[PDB]
Structures are given as C-alpha cells and as structure tokens.
C-alpha cells in the first residue's frame, strides 16, 4: 500500500499532480493533496446560442450591439476573445408547429410577417477572432416562430456542446455557452406528444451546419445535458428575460458548472451580464470524480482560502487568481474485483489516478 507522485515535469498549468499512482489492499486507504491554481487572462471562447422563436422578436435586435462593446469589456478578463453564433426554435413537428401547407414554412403568416421557417438548431458562425463577422451574422438574423410556449433550448445546447469540430471550440480556452431566452425549455419526455419515443443518444448530428435529427430524437434529459456539458468542459450561462428566469435559476442545483442571470426589460445589460457571469464562474472551484474502478470509494474535501472546509463538489467560492485551492482526496478499497478521473468542473485540465491493487 502506497501513494506515488510522478517526479516528471508536469504537463498541467492549473491542476497538479496531473497523474497519481496508488496501491491499495481491501480495508486500506491512502490519500494525496490535489492543488488547483486558476489563471488570469484565459483565452475565452464565447458562443451565442440564441432563441429566435417569435416571443424573442423584441430581443434579437438588442444583440446588434454585443460585438465590439463586449470585446472591449472582455479585454480585462481574457487573453484571446472569440465570438460564435447560432440559434434555435423548437422541434419542427406537430403539435409544436402548425403543419398547414400555407404557414408550415412561415409560422407568422397569419400576421403578414416575414418569419424564418422553424428549425431545431442551426449553427451560423464558427467561433472567430473577427468581431465584425459576429455582428454581421447577428444583423442578418431573421425571427422565426412556433405555437407552444416552451422552446427546444436543451436540445440545441447539447448539440452546441458536443459538435466541437463544427463550433470550433478550443481546448486551450475557457468554453462559455451563452443561452439567450425568455420562456422555459422542453423536457425529455415532452416529445412523446409529437410521437417521438426515441431517447437522445447525446451524439453530434449536424449536417450542413443544421441539426437533422431534431424530428426523430427526443429532447435530452438534464442528466444527459449536464453529463455532456461537463465532459466537453463547457460552462453555461443562462440569460433569461422573463419571469421564467427563476425557473432556470432553480435548476442550477441540478446542473453543476452553470450560472444564470436576468436580462433587463430593455436588454441594457447584455454585455454586463456576460462579463459578470464570466467573472463569477471563474471564482468557483469544485471537483467531481469519475470512478469506473470497482471496489474503490473516493472521499474528497475542499480546503478553502479562509480555512473553511467544503465536502465533495460543494466547492470553494470567492477564489481569485494567485489563489490556490486544495482538495484532500482519500481513496479507500472496500472489496476485491483501471483508473479514475478527478476534475474541476469547467476546467480544461484533469487529474488521472491509476489504482493498483492486490488481495
């Protein structure tokens, strides 16, 4: 029974030791200290996932000014700031949309408006250093619509999170998925009403930058959504204008690595909301462990800057740059029968622990 910390040069800048090797016997335990040191001036990838359903027609134009102004504000929080853009509405199936031939491709037809055909999720702009391109992509964006109040937000989010090769998310960046909406989102089983009885497999299904399984697969569950967001190291910011802000706020305990705030009725805080959410997310440190090793139990306690202790993934708050947080990791073997991964949520570095054992 032992714990070995490699003496090799670390390949991690924030989370060390990058690798840990231990040996256990049943009834025995070993421990180590995991250190996390958040950086200043992170490269930041901000992707805008915008609700473009009819209820958002008063808000889409408010994004015409979240390009250059945001880029300037982020100059003091980031090293390299890129913007991307896409949009979502709902599943293009009955009963969520009208299927009448004269309005199926223009749900707003009855009001004599020129609305964009309804769609699930469309990727418009890959993350880019060119702010002008972002603004252009927004300025030429049309408004769509559907019938039912709830929108396919979670479905679009999953695709935005998993389709890394299409979005252009960088590993060497803080990945921020910004979701703009007003109403609540659909849940995994709501789709039964549309005759969709096939679980979301969590994979990437974009064809020509368009999600094409939106009418065959149901909405993702919160379980699946948080699983994929954490796995792809994506931090989520919910920006909600309506009273439903509170609905999203109260889902936060179920979705680790997620923050939510409110959009003002005049959308005067769109850039302030993104900046505050970013600054708040970087001050929260918590880890979780993916334990695929049978017979092994993990017990992790966070040691916070003020000397307080917080168990498991409860996390430490008010952590700054040049401020280290320690996690005391105890690993114990209970029974005879690989490795486990301990990672900070929202970080692009992990600690991999290999467990040798004998009986």
């Amino acid at each position: 029974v032992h714990v070995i910390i490699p003496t090799e040069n670390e390949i991690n800048t924030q989370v060390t030791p990058g690798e840990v090797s231990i040996q256990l016997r049943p009834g025995a335990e070993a421990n180590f200290m995991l250190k996390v040191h958040p950086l200043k001036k992170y490269p930041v990838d901000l992707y805008y996932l915008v609700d473009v359903s009819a209820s958002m027609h008063n808000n889409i134009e408010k994004l015409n000014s979240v390009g250059n102004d945001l880029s300037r504000k982020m100059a003091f929080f980031s090293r390299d700031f890129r913007l991307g853009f896409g949009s979502y509405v709902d599943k293009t199936v009955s009963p969520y949309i009208s299927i009448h031939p004269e309005r199926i491709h223009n749900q707003c037809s009855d009001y004599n408006l020129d609305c964009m055909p309804p769609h699930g999720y469309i990727h418009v702009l890959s993350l880019t250093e060119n702010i002008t391109e972002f603004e252009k992509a927004v300025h030429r964006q049309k408004i769509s619509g559907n019938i039912d109040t709830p929108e396919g937000g979670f479905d679009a989010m999953l695709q935005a999170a998993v389709c890394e090769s299409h979005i252009g998310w960088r590993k060497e960046a803080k990945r921020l998925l910004l979701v703009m909406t007003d109403q609540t989102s659909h849940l995994a089983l709501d789709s039964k009403l549309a005759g969709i009885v096939v679980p979301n497999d969590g994979n990437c299904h974009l064809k020509n930058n368009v999600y094409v399984k939106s009418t065959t697969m149901e909405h993702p569950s919160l379980g699946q959504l948080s699983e994929k967001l954490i796995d792809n190291n994506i931090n989520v910011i919910f920006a909600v204008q309506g009273k439903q802000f509170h609905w999203y706020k109260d889902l936060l305990p179920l979705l680790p690595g997620t923050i939510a705030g409110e959009i003002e009725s005049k959308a005067a805080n769109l850039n302030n909301l993104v900046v505050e959410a970013y600054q708040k997310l970087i001050s929260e440190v918590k880890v979780q462990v993916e334990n695929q090793v049978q017979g092994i139990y993990f017990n992790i306690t966070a040691i916070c800057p003020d000397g307080s202790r917080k168990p498991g993934m409860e996390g430490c708050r008010n952590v700054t740059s040049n401020d280290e947080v320690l996690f005391n990791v105890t690993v114990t073997m209970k029974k005879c029968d690989n490795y486990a991964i301990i990672k900070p949520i929202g970080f692009n570095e992990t600690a991999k622990i290999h467990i040798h054992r004998n009986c």
Partner: protein
C-alpha cells in the same frame, strides 16, 4: 451607434410605401384585450378601433402642426366581396358617416388607407382621452389583422404587429 436600423425605423420606412420637409410618425391602436372591448364589444356586423389621444399628442401635440393623417388597416383574404362603411366618433358617444369602400376579393393580405386628416385634427383639438373609429357592413364577414385575445403562446406578442394604425405627417417645429 450607426449602421443597422432599429425595428421602429425600418418598419416606418416600409409603412410609408406599403399602400399602392415633413416628419412622419405612427400611432397604433389600443389592444383589443386592453381597451377595445372594455368600452363595448365586437359584434358580428361591426368593428371598433380606439386610439390613445395622449400618445398621439406626444407625436403631434398641436392641431395646427398636423399636415396629414391616414388610417391604415390590414385586410385579410376576402375571397368574394364586402361592402363596408367607416364612421367618425362625435360627442364621445355618437357615430356619423365619414366614408365607405367596396372591398375586392383579395387572395392575400392588403393594406388599405383612408384620409382622416380632418378627423385627427378635430380629435387633437378636443380635450379627450379616447378617440376612435367604427366600421360596419352596409352581415360583416371580412377579417382584418388583430382584434383577438385568444392568441397566446409563442406567437402571443407578434399578434400585435401590423395591427391598424394612424400614419401622421406634420410640419417640424423648427421649420414652422
């Protein structure tokens, strides 16, 4: 912040050319679920259109500043025909003939316009809070955009778009 246009500006630009040294503004009708059906009701022979006089005055505050006014309605597919008449409100409780129209069997939505310059000027002068128009069949089977409250859900808000309005033209105060 030059470059893009806001919805209000682009919409006005297109509105002034939708029907086929002055400033132009628009005053939109009051929501039917807010005021139109609180003063009376809709009936299967007539329709009411109410406007907020204070809101109008904010755009054109004086009876001697107004140069022109038009009442704009969006007619929906009619198919065959309808003969209707438009009335002005007097003494806050009476209606009198103003003008009328023979409505064509349109296939698509179309904007109609009436010259109401004199009407608006009189209502602008009158120290009243509520002004409006009445339309009726010469029995009424022509639908126009808006005038409903049973529409909610995602399209709840766009319901108020392209609703009837007064298009007002007036002399700039600077030009006098």
């Amino acid at each position: 912040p030059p470059g893009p246009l806001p919805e209000a500006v682009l919409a006005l630009y297109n509105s002034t050319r939708d029907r086929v040294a002055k400033e132009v503004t628009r005053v939109l009708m009051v929501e039917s679920g807010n005021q139109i059906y609180d003063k009376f009701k809709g009936t299967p022979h007539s329709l009411y259109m109410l406007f907020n006089t204070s809101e109008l005055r904010e755009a054109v505050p004086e009876p001697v500043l107004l140069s022109r006014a038009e009442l704009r309605l969006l007619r929906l597919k009619l198919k065959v025909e309808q003969h209707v008449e438009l009335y002005q409100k007097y003494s806050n409780d009476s209606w009198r003939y103003l003008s009328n129209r023979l409505l064509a069997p349109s296939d698509s939505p179309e904007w109609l316009s009436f010259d109401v310059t004199g009407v608006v000027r009189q209502w602008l002068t009158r120290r009243e809070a509520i002004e409006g128009f009445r339309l009726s069949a010469h029995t009424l089977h022509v639908e126009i955009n808006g005038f409903n409250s049973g529409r909610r859900g995602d399209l709840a808000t766009i319901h108020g778009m392209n609703r009837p309005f007064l298009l007002l033209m007036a002399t700039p105060l600077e030009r006098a």
